[PDB]
C-alpha cells in the first residue's frame, strides 16, 4: 500500500501509451493517437509483500507536450526509458532522456525497454544495445503487443524500491486460507 513516482519517458510512438494501457485493459490497441498532456495512470500489483501503488506518468514523445520536458521528473521515484527495436533512431535518440532525467531525479532506478520485439523486422539488434551495460540500468526486450515480459520492468522496479529480491507478484489465484491448510497430505497418516 504505497504510491510511487514512475516516469514513462521515451521517444514518441514507441509504445508507452499502449504499454500502460495493456496493464489496464485486457487486450492490445493499435492506432497511434499521440499523447499530448502527459497522462497519469495509476497501477497496482499484488505482491508477496503486499500491494503496490504505481502512478505511471505516461509522458509524451511528440511536440504535443514536447514543451513540458522535465517537471514531472521532479521528485520522481523510478523511470522507464522506452524505445523501439524496429526503429533505428529511438535507441539513438535515447541517452538524451537518461540525462534529461538523471538531471532531475538524481539516482532513481531506471529500466530501459526495447519494445515491439514482436516484429520480424528488428532494426535495433540486441547486440547493438550496450547502453544499460554502461550507464548501468536494467534492460528488457518487451512487447506491449503480445505481453512478452510486459511485467518485468515493474517487478524489477518494485524490487529495487522496496529493497527485497524475494519480492514477486502473485498472479497465482487464492486457495484455502493459508492458516487452515490441512497437513501436507502425508502428514495426514503419519
Amino acid at each position: 500500500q504505497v504510491q510511487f513516482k514512475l516516469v514513462l519517458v521515451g521517444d514518441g510512438g514507441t509504445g508507452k501509451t499502449t504499454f500502460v494501457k495493456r496493464h489496464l485493459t485486457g487486450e492490445f490497441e493499435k492506432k497511434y493517437v499521440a499523447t499530448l498532456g502527459v497522462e497519469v495512470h495509476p497501477l497496482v500489483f499484488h505482491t508477496n509483500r503486499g500491494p503496490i501503488k504505481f502512478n505511471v506518468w505516461d509522458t509524451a514523445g511528440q511536440e504535443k507536450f514536447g514543451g513540458l520536458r522535465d517537471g514531472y521528473y521532479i521528485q520522481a521515484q523510478c523511470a522507464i526509458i522506452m524505445f523501439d527495436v524496429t526503429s533505428r533512431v529511438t535507441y539513438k535518440n535515447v541517452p538524451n532522456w537518461h540525462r534529461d532525467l538523471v538531471r532531475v531525479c538524481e539516482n532513481i532506478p531506471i529500466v530501459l525497454c526495447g519494445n515491439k520485439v514482436d516484429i520480424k523486422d528488428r532494426k535495433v539488434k540486441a547486440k547493438s544495445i550496450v547502453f544499460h551495460r554502461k550507464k548501468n540500468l536494467q534492460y528488457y526486450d518487451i512487447s506491449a503487443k503480445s505481453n512478452y515480459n510486459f511485467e518485468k520492468p515493474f517487478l524489477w522496479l518494485a524490487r529495487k524500491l522496496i529493497g527485497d529480491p524475494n519480492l514477486e507478484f502473485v498472479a497465482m489465484p487464492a486457495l484455502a486460507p493459508p492458516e487452515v491448510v490441512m497437513d501436507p497430505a502425508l502428514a495426514a497418516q503419519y
Partner: protein, 880 residues
C-alpha cells in the same frame, strides 16, 4: 499589488502541476499555455526559486523554479533568441548563480539551464562563462558549509561543460585546475570534479597525456568515498592511446586485479568489465606473468551471488515441471525462409551469435568473469591449462554447489580454445560430470548439461560404451523430470549431441525416441517448443535411418495430437511444422501414410494467406493484416514433402493448385515468400516435372528477374531452381540461356558475395553447360576460376557430380578456355574422393590433355608436387 495577485496564481498552478491527474492534465494544460501570451509576468514569475521555496511549499516551488522554468529554454532554443535576448532577464537569473545552496535539491534544478541557455546562445562565451573561474577555485570551501554551497555548483560545470583554435588555447589554463580539487575530503568535491576531469577528447587534448602524475595521484586515489573510486576505476581502463600506460603498467594491473575485488559489487563491475578489455597483442605480453595473477579471482567470481542466487532459486526448486508457463514468458519467434545450401564435411557461429537475446539483460559480474575470460582462447590458448586443474580439481567437490558449479562452469567455459590441451584430462573429467547430472543440485545439473555438451564432440569421436552411451543415457533422464530449467539445458545439450553423433546415434534410436515421446506428456509450453526442435534435429541427423515401423509408429501419434490441436493462427505451428518439415524428409515415402492432410493444410494456408493479404490491402478497416510467415512455413513444408516423397507426391500435386499458387508466390512483394517458392519449384521440378514443364515458359523469365543480387537469399534459391530445371529438360533449355546466363556469370564474379550463392551459381552454370555445351562453353574463361575456387570445397554428391559433368563437357568443346587456368581445375578434380567411373574417365581425358600441353616431364614434375592425398587421387584419375 500589480502582478502580486497573479504570482499567487502560480502557487495555485503548482498545486495542480505537482499533484497532476487526468482532469488537471488535459485541463491545466490550458492555463499553463495561456500564460505564455501575457509575458509581462513570466520574466518575473520565475525568480521564484528562493521566492516560492522561500514562500510556501518546497517540493512544489522546485517544480516551477526548477520546473516550468526549463520549459522556457524551449522558447529560446525554438526562437533563435530574437525573443527575450534581454540581458537583464539574462543576468537576473545569471545572478541566481550566486545562490547555490537553497536546499541542495533546488541547488541544481536551475543549473541545467546554464547548459541549455548557452547552447542556444553559445557565442558570448564569457559574460556567463565567467562564473567558470569566478567560482572555479572558489569551491575551495567558501560558502554554506565550505563546499556545501560552492561544491553544489562545481559539479554543475561537469554537466554544463561536457553536456554542451577558436577558444582552444584559452581554456587550457583552467581545466588544469581540476587536478587540484582532488585530495579534498568532500565526496562531490572529489569525484564530482574527478570523473569529470577525465571526460577527454580532442577539444583540448593537452594537459591530458602529459599527466603521468594524475596516474599515480590516482593510482593511489582509492575510495575518497565510494561512488567515486568506481568512476575512477572507470577511466584507467578507458583509453586507446596507451602510450603513457606502457610505463606505469605493471602496477595498474596490480592495483586493479584487486580493485575489481573491492566488496562493493557496483565497483567490481566498473572495474572487471572495463579491465579485461584485452585489445591488441601487447595486452598479453603482460598477461604472461599474469597467468596465476587472475585465474583464481575470476574463477572465484564464476559463482552466483547470494541474490542472483535468490532471483534464480525461484523457479529452480525441482517442482515447477507441473507449473504452466506464462504467456509473458514466450519470447516472439519467427520463421526464416529456407535457403538451399551445400555441405562441407564436419565443417553455426554466423547464425548462433545472431541470438544474444538474454545475456544483454543480466549484467552482473558472473556474466563478465567468463565474459571477459572470453580472450583466453581468442588472444591466447592452453596457456591457462597448467595450474587451473587443482582449482577445478577440488572445485569439483569442494564445499556445496556454489563452488562445484563455478567449476563445472569454467570447464565448459574454456573448451572452445583450450580444447586440445584439455583433451588430455578429458578422459577422466567427462565420466565424472556425467555424475553431477544425477545429483539434486538442480542449478548445477544445468551447467553439468551445458558443459558436457560444451565439448561432447570428443565423447562422440571416441568408443561407444566408454561414455557416448552413458552420457546419452543420463542426459536423457534429465530431459525428463527435474525442473523446467533443467529440462531446457538438458534438451538444448542433447540437441547438440545429435548434430554431432550424426548417424552414430542410429543404434540407440528406439531408446532416444521413447525419451522424447514421453516428454510431450510432461513438458510445458516454453519447453515443448524446444522438444519440437530437438526431434527435427534428431531427424536431420539420423537420416532415412528413422524410417522404420517401430520408430514411426511411436513418433507420429504425439505429433498428430498437436497438429489437430492448433488453430491455423497459433504460432506454435512454426516449431511443429518445422519439425514435421524435417521428419517428413527422413521418412522418405515412409511418411506417405500421413502426407495427404499435411499437404492439404499447407496448400490451404497459402490459399488463405494470399487472400487475407489482398483483402487487408483494400479494406484495412475490416480485414486484419496477415502474417506472411505462415505462407513461408507452409511453403517450406510442401518443399519438404516433395523432397521426401519425391515422385510419390505426383498425384497430390495433380489434384491441387500449387502450380497456380506458384505464379502467385513467385510474384509476391515479400522476398522471403518469393525465396521459399523457388526452393519449392526446385524440389517439385525434381519430383514431378511432368506437372511443371507446361509452365516453364512462364516461370523461367520470372526466375530470370529474380537473379537480382539485391536479395541474395532469393537469388540463391532462384539460382538453384534454374539448375534443377535445366537438367530436367536438356537441350530444350537452349532458348532460355540468354535470359539467365549473363546474370549467372555476373554473380559468380561478384565481390563480397556469400559462399552459398557462389556455390549454387557455380553448380547451375555447370548444369546449363552440361545441357548446352555449345552455348555456355565459349564463356569458360569468364567463370572457370571462381567456379573451381568455389566447388573444390563442396562434398561429393549429386549436385557436385552434375556440375562437373557439365564443365568436363564444355572443356572438351573449348579446351583453350581452360588451359591457362589448368592448375585451378586440377585442384577442383582432386577434391573428389570417389567419383563415378563415368565421370572419372572424363577427368582422365582432360588431364592427359594437360599433360599433352606441358609435356611429359613438366606434367610428371607438376603432378608430383601435391600433398600426398590429392597427389594420389590425381594419379588414380590419370592412367599412364
Amino acid at each position: 499589488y500589480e502582478w502580486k495577485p497573479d504570482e499567487q496564481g502560480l502557487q495555485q498552478i503548482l498545486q495542480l502541476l505537482k499533484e497532476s491527474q487526468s482532469p488537471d492534465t488535459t485541463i491545466q494544460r490550458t492555463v499553463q499555455q495561456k500564460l505564455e501570451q501575457l509575458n509581462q509576468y513570466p520574466d518575473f514569475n520565475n525568480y521564484l526559486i528562493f521566492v516560492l521555496t522561500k514562500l510556501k511549499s518546497e517540493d512544489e516551488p522546485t517544480r516551477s523554479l526548477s520546473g516550468l522554468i526549463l520549459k522556457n529554454n524551449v522558447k529560446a532554443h525554438f526562437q533563435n533568441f530574437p525573443n527575450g535576448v534581454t540581458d537583464f532577464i539574462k543576468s537576473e537569473c545569471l545572478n541566481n548563480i550566486g545562490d547555490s545552496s537553497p536546499l541542495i535539491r533546488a541547488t541544481v534544478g536551475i543549473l541545467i539551464t546554464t547548459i541549455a541557455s548557452k547552447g542556444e546562445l553559445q557565442n558570448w562565451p564569457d559574460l556567463l562563462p565567467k562564473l567558470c573561474s569566478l567560482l572555479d577555485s572558489e569551491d575551495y570551501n567558501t560558502c554554506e558549509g565550505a563546499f556545501g554551497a560552492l561544491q553544489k555548483i562545481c559539479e554543475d560545470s561537469a554537466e554544463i561543460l561536457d553536456s554542451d583554435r577558436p577558444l582552444n588555447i584559452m581554456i587550457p589554463k583552467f581545466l588544469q585546475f581540476f587536478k587540484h580539487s582532488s585530495p579534498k575530503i568532500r565526496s562531490h568535491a572529489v569525484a564530482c570534479v574527478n570523473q569529470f576531469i577525465i571526460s577527454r577528447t580532442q577539444a583540448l587534448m593537452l594537459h591530458i597525456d602529459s599527466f603521468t602524475e594524475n596516474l599515480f595521484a590516482l593510482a593511489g586515489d582509492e575510495e575518497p568515498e565510494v561512488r567515486k573510486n568506481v568512476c575512477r576505476a572507470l577511466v584507467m581502463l578507458l583509453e586507446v592511446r596507451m602510450d603513457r600506460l606502457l610505463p606505469h603498467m605493471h602496477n595498474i594491473v596490480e592495483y586493479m586485479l584487486q580493485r575489481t575485488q573491492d566488496q562493493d559489487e557496483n565497483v567490481a563491475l566498473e572495474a572487471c568489465e572495463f579491465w579485461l578489455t584485452l585489445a591488441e597483442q601487447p595486452i598479453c605480453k603482460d598477461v604472461l606473468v599474469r597467468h596465476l595473477p587472475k585465474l583464481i579471482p575470476v574463477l572465484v567470481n564464476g559463482m552466483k551471488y547470494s541474490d542472483i542466487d535468490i532471483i534464480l532459486l525461484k523457479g529452480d526448486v525441482e517442482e515447477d515441471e507441473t507449473i504452466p508457463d506464462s504467456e509473458q514468458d514466450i519470447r516472439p519467434r519467427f520463421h526464416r525462409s529456407r535457403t538451399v545450401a551445400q555441405q562441407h564435411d564436419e565443417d553455426d557461429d554466423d547464425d548462433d551469435e545472431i541470438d544474444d537475446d538474454d545475456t544483454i539483460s543480466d549484467w552482473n559480474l558472473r556474466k563478465c568473469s567468463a565474459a571477459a575470460l572470453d580472450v583466453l582462447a581468442n588472444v591466447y590458448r592452453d596457456e591457462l591449462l597448467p595450474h587451473i586443474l587443482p582449482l577445478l580439481k577440488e572445485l569439483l567437490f569442494h564445499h556445496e554447489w556454489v563452488v562445484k558449479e563455478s567449476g563445472i562452469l569454467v570447464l565448459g567455459a574454456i573448451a572452445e580454445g583450450c580444447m586440445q590441451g584439455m583433451i588430455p584430462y578429458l578422459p577422466e573429467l567427462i565420466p565424472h560430470l556425467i555424475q553431477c547430472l544425477s545429483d539434486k543440485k538442480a542449478l548445477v545439473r544445468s551447467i553439468t548439461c551445458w558443459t558436457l555438451s560444451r565439448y561432447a564432440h570428443w565423447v562422440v569421436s571416441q568408443p561407444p560404451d566408454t561414455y557416448l552411451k552413458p552420457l546419452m543415457t543420463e542426459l536423457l533422464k534429465r530431459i525428463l523430470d527435474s525442473n523446467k530449467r533443467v529440462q531446457e539445458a538438458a534438451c538444448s545439450a542433447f540437441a547438440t549431441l545429435e548434430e554431432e553423433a550424426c548417424t552414430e546415434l542410429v543404434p540407440y534410436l528406439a531408446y532416444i525416441l521413447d525419451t522424447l515421446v514421453f516428454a510431450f506428456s510432461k513438458y510445458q509450453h516454453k519447453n515443448l517448443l524446444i522438444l519440437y526442435d530437438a526431434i527435427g534435429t534428431l531427424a536431420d541427423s539420423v537420416g532415412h535411418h528413422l524410417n522404420k515401423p517401430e520408430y514411426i509408429q511411436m513418433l507420429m501419434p504425439p505429433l498428430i495430437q498437436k497438429w489437430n490441436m492448433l488453430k491455423d493462427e497459433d504460432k506454435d505451428l512454426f516449431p511443429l511444422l518445422e519439425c514435421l518439415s524435417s521428419v517428413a524428409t527422413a521418412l522418405q515415402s515412409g511418411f506417405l501414410p500421413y502426407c495427404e492432410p499435411v499437404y492439404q493444410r499447407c496448400v490451404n494456408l497459402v490459399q488463405k494467406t494470399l487472400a487475407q493479404a489482398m483483402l487487408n490491402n483494400a479494406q484495412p478497416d475490416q480485414y486484419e493484416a496477415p502474417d506472411k510467415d505462415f505462407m513461408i512455413v507452409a511453403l517450406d513444408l510442401l518443399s519438404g514433402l516433395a523432397e521426401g516423397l519425391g515422385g510419390n507426391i505426383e498425384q497430390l500435386v495433380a489434384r491441387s493448385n500449387i502450380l497456380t499458387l506458384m505464379y502467385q508466390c513467385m510474384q509476391d512483394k515479400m522476398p522471403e515468400v518469393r525465396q521459399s517458392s523457388f526452393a519449392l519449384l526446385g524440389d517439385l521440378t525434381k519430383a514431378c516435372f511432368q506437372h511443371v514443364k507446361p509452365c516453364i515458359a512462364d516461370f523461367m523469365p520470372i526466375l530470370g528477374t529474380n537473379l537480382n543480387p539485391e536479395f541474395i537469399s532469393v537469388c540463391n534459391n532462384a539460382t538453384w531452381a534454374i539448375g534443377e530445371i535445366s537438367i530436367q529438360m536438356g537441350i530444350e533449355m537452349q532458348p532460355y540461356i540468354p535470359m539467365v546466363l549473363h546474370q549467372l556469370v555476373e554473380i559468380i564474379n561478384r565481390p563480397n558475395t556469400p559462399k552459398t550463392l557462389l556455390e549454387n551459381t557455380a553448380i547451375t552454370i555447370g548444369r546449363l553447360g552440361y545441357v548446352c555445351p555449345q552455348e555456355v562453353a565459349p564463356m569458360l574463361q569468364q567463370f572457370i576460376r571462381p567456379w573451381c575456387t568455389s566447388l573444390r570445397n563442396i562434398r561429393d554428391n549429386e549436385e557436385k557430380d552434375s556440375a562437373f559433368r557439365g564443365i568436363c563437357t564444355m572443356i572438351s568443346v573449348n579446351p583453350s578456355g581452360v588451359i591457362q587456368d589448368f592448375i585451378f581445375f586440377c585442384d577442383a578434380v582432386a577434391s573428389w574422393i570417389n567419383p563415378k567411373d563415368d565421370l572419372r574417365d572424363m577427368f582422365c581425358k582432360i588431364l592427359h590433355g594437360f599433360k599433352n600441353q606441358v609435356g611429359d616431364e613438366n606434367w610428371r614434375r607438376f603432378s608430383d608436387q601435391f600433398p600426398l592425398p590429392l597427389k594420389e587421387r590425381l594419379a588414380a584419375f590419370y592412367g599412364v
